[PDB]
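Before relying on records like the one below, remember that each one covers exactly one chain. Contacts with other chains, cofactors or solvent are not represented anywhere in the record.
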Amino acid sequence: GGVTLFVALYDYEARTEDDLSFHKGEKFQIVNNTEGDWWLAHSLTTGETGYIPSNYVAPV
């Protein structure tokens, strides 16, 4: 029931236009996970949406 938030396990510096940079501990709602291993995510810190590498996060 409800949503599953994700938390960053490691800092990450984006290297492409639509990717988010984030810190360890930053939390996300996942907007789309049906395109492959990069997920469209919405940061609970910044309010921004962009891609994150899914291996950098774990379910909260």
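The chain is about 0% helix and 40% strand.
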